[PDB]
């Protein structure tokens, strides 16, 4: 309850938590990323950040005497690895000794307009750089704060804040039931996708295409990313079920935007998208449905929208675009990811998503992960 509405931002500019670092404390805005495992802050001035962590001003700051380079899908940074005391004002009332990387060089990491000046990698030890032996932030917090090995996210920034609950589930942040999908591999939050349906129509694809090379839940990825073959099938299915007579090829790639004049909204011209996930009882599945309000994103009185789905080389990424419709539980202690209906996930007083189940897995393989 102390952690309710402790995030700021949206899928576009990222969801970020306020953190107090060092002695005396310096306040920073930290991006919540379930796609990486390093805690890093800007340590020198930069053109697209208004604040940075100054290690010279901290009496508790200690250097490990080595560097680290971390590469993402979009962006990279190089920093010194050190240690310092951290407090999370909104939630905890005690300090923690954590590993911290101070960025002194970056390439397409800190972009213009962003309100955050650091990153919080909430994924597993396996992804920590330089190695797995570099204690992650959440591993330090679970050990030092006496909390269950669970965290949950409620993203409320769809269209035109949120909550990061460290240590549990807040019942006031969801409605109905929680559906759980097993974590297949503990590196990223890798889950199993069984089927995709556009306007109630199933794609003509083997369930393995969806887990090529992995299907993950990532709060640091803006859009829904699909392997090229899956992506082409989705574009074909969306165009067929849409009320827009013809589309320009650049709309699908992000090179062209769809612009409506007057006060007119796009959402009634597009179908729903459903993703089927395996339940904890393998004979069952549940589906998470997103309405156009989540995948048709705002950017002569024109209002322009981009396609909120992008092709990927070898990964299906459930971005902050999909997470904006649900209360998502990262249940590390029980090796599972939970999804629930989020009351805050609504634009113009209407739901932007749905959750339904159970369904039969008989028409699909016992394992869809190649």
């Amino acid at each position, epitope marked *: 309850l102390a952690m309710v509405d402790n995030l700021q931002g949206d899928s576009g500019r990222g969801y970020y938590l306020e953190m107090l670092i060092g002695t005396p404390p310096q306040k920073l805005q930290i991006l919540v990323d379930t796609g990486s495992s390093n805690f890093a802050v800007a340590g020198t001035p930069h053109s697209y950040i208004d604040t940075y962590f100054d290690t010279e001003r901290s009496s508790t700051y200690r250097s490990k005497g080595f560097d680290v380079t971390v590469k993402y899908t979009q962006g990279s940074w190089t920093g010194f690895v050190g240690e310092d005391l951290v407090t999370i004002p909104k939630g905890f009332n005690t300090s923690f000794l954590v590993n911290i990387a101070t960025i002194f060089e970056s390439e397409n990491f800190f972009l213009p307009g962003i309100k955050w000046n650091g990153i919080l990698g909430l994924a597993y030890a396996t992804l920590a750089k330089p190695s797995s*032996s570099l204690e992650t932030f959440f591993d330090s917090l679970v050990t030092q704060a006496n909390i269950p090995n669970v965290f949950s996210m409620q993203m409320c920034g769809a269209g035109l804040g949120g909550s990061l609950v460290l240590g549990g589930i807040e019942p006031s942040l969801y409605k109905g039931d929680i559906w759980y999908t097993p974590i297949k591999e503990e590196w990223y939050y890798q889950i199993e996708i069984l089927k995709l349906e556009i306007g109630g129509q199933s794609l003509n694809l083997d369930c393995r295409e969806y887990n090529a090379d992995k299907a993950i839940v990532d709060s640091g990825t803006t859009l829904l990313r699909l392997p090229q073959k899956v992506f082409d099938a989705v574009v074909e299915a969306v165009a067929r079920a849409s009320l827009i007579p013809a589309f320009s090829d650049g709309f699908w790639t992000g090179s062209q935007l769809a612009c409506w004049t007057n006060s007119e909204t796009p959402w009634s011209y597009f179908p729903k998208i459903s993703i089927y996930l395996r339940d904890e009882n393998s004979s069952r599945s549940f589906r998470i449905t997103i309405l156009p309000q989540l995948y048709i994103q705002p950017m002569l009185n024109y209002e322009c929208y981009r396609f909120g789905i992008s092709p990927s080389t070898n990964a299906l990424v459930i971005g902050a675009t999909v997470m904006e419709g649900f209360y998502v539980i990262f249940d590390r202690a029980q090796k599972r990811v939970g999804f629930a209906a989020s009351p805050c996930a609504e634009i113009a007083g209407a739901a932007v998503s749905e959750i339904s189940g159970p369904f039969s897995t008989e028409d699909v393989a016992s394992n869809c992960v190649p």
Partner: nanobody
Amino acid sequence: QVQLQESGGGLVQPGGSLRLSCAASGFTFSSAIMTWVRQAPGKGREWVSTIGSDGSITTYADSVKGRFTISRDNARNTLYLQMNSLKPEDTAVYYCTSAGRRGPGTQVTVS
């Protein structure tokens, strides 16, 4: 991989003392944050103490402050916990932990 092994646990009377040790291998110990955690019967896991890689930065749970002292010898790859003025509430399996890994533990009983 990361290897940790605790020792020095025993059975003492209230007011007693114990010196816990933890031997580490498989990772660069001299570059790691080290923690002591305890698990008492019928209660949840409780954080005891944390020490920074060079030993200068130390933190303690309010329940152990002034009674326990965490230390480390980086040349010898060993972490320590000096437990003085022991009380029955301190009965627990004490674990040595780093980067999600723990040792097999060391049982402490205070009559």
